[PDB]
Design a binder for this molecule. Structure first.
Ligand SMILES: Nc1ncnc2c1ncn2[C@@H]1O[C@H](COP(=O)(O)OP(=O)(O)OP(O)(O)=S)[C@@H](O)[C@H]1O
Ligand SMILES: [Mg+2]
Lengths: 78, 411
């Protein structure tokens, strides 16, 4: 499912591309940790909780990079 | 993924380099004399995978190099090779080659022949389904003794550990730290989208009084690029609120963890026992943190009667079997890809020896086993057979036929 991506984000996170970070929907990745089809050990719910927060971090990591170029590009011509 | 092959050089009774023939994907059984090198082999695997041996004192460094007659070695290595033909290891090879080398003041891993950090490995493994939280991929008779004699308290000390109620908190903290480190970016972001917002608003009033220049040309581009970021911040501002719903629901479920893993493992317990001892009846009893003081066992081999016995009143190998049943029920609650067993039948007769060999023939279809025995019953369930000889200050391990193994444990 999508949990394979979150899983991969929690441990071997360097196998996620910018396009995967962007295309990934945090809202529905959460929706499938909270309502799992095979209810999971609390030990792996926390592994997932970390994988999500990695992506949320890395999303903000890119937005803030983009948001600065957007500022210096218009601060320049003006 | 399973263990396809192992290589040892310089490690305990293994002076010269030994390259074990590649394993069956199912039940492998090793046989050998006393002090021959069985439990040394299992220790080599552990030197690579098991989390305890990741950080070694300078004396354990010395207690691993082959100490003996010749030029007393200064470095030793072990290489495991995993059959990745299930891609459970996040890597685009059919075989993964993880090795660890050690000397005095020297300790380095090698993932497919390139160096890595000890932390790198423990993450690559965790994501293959191989917890550093899981101590039960490997069972020695040390643990079966320790678990048959153990009191009702030490067994509750075992559920608290299985519920994962402590690693969850370890991650839950690792999470709230990022969550805050990230919540820092969000106030930086939410601030540049206030400069760009107002710098673009005056740039529009400049544009309207005309009814410098290169900014006025592509204003609508700046406008268009900005509202795209606004979209992304509204994504964050919305996934944040979502992660909070998650964190909330997990803390509710941590306080149901212990009561939860009890009922599962109790149910698994009675299952494993009723097929190890067909006819039997066994159960776990919660007894008076919390007001939980212990987890005791109530077994009735004798069919199921008013011949239930609390567990310390059981026989000596009856306690061995029940400890083995508990280890089976717990692994069901947390499967691993391969299991190492080091003399588990040592205290059971010949009938309970079979019943354990039978019940491993079942689990072999779904995971790998490598085991050592002294009696021919864990030999019928098996698919490949090895012997360990000791010949000339060193250990040799080679493939033997199934009759070579029975002739060795029946003579
Ligand atoms: N660092 C070492 N260097 C050389 N030999 C060692 C070293 N450590 C242990 N040995 C010897 O390795 C031999 C075999 O060790 P083990 O693997 O425990 O054999 P074993 O098959 O487990 O024997 P059992 O468990 O009694 S049936 C023993 O004679 C040890 O004394
Ligand atoms: Mg031994």
């Amino acid at each position: 499912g999508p949990l394979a991506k979150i899983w991969l984000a929690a441990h071997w996170d360097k196998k996620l591309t910018k396009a995967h970070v962007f295309e990934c929907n945090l809202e529905s990745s959460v929706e499938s940790i909270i309502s799992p089809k095979v209810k999971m050990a609390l030990r792996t719910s926390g592994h997932l909780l970390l994988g999500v927060v990695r992506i949320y971090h890395r999303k903000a990591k890119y937005l803030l990079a983009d948001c600065n170029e957007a500022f210096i590009k218009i601060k320049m011509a003006f | 993924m399973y263990i396809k092959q192992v290589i040892i050089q310089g490690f305990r009774s293994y002076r010269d380099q030994t390259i074990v023939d590649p394993f069956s994907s199912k039940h492998n059984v090793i046989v050998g004399r006393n002090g021959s090198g069985k439990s040394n082999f299992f220790y080599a695997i552990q030197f690579v995978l098991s989390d305890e041996f990741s950080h070694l004192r300078p004396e354990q460094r010395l207690a691993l190099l082959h100490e003996g007659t010749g030029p007393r070695v200064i470095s030793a290595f072990v290489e495991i090779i995993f059959d990745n033909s299930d891609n459970r290891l996040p890597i685009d090879k059919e075989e993964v080659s993880l090795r660890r080398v050690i000397g005095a003041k020297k300790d380095q891993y090698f993932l497919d022949k390139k160096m890595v950090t000890k932390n790198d490995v423990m993450n690559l493994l965790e994501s293959a389904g191989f917890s550093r939280s899981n101590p039960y991929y490997i069972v020695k008779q040390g643990k079966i003794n320790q678990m048959a004699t153990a009191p009702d308290s030490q067994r509750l000390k075992l559920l608290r550990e299985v519920a994962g109620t402590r690693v969850y908190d370890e991650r839950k903290e690792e999470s709230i730290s990022l969550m805050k480190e990230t919540e820092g970016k969000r106030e930086k972001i939410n601030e540049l989208l206030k400069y760009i917002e107002e710098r673009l608003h005056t740039l529009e009033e400049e544009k309207e009084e005309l009814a410098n220049k290169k900014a006025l040309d592509q204003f609508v581009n700046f406008s268009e690029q900005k509202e795209k970021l606004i979209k992304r911040q509204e994504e964050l501002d919305r996934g944040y609120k979502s992660i909070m719903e998650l964190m909330n629901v997990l803390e509710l479920r941590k306080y149901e963890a212990i009561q939860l893993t009890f009922k599962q493992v109790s149910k698994n317990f009675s299952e494993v026992f009723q097929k190890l001892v067909p006819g039997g009846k066994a159960t776990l009893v919660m007894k008076k943190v919390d007001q939980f003081t212990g987890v005791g066992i109530r077994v009735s081999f004798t069919g199921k009667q008013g011949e239930m016995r609390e567990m310390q009143q059981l026989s000596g190998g009856q306690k061995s079997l029940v400890a083995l049943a508990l280890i089976f029920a717990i692994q069901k609650c947390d499967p691993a890809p391969f299991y190492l067993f080091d003399q588990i039948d040592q205290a059971l007769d010949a009938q309970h020896r079979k019943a354990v060999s039978d019940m491993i023939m079942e689990l072999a279809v779904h995971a790998q086993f490598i085991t050592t025995t002294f009696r021919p019953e864990l030999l019928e369930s098996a698919d490949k057979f090895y012997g360990v000889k000791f010949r000339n200050k060193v250990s040799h391990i080679d493939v033997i036929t199934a009759e070579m193994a029975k002739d060795f444990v029946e003579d």
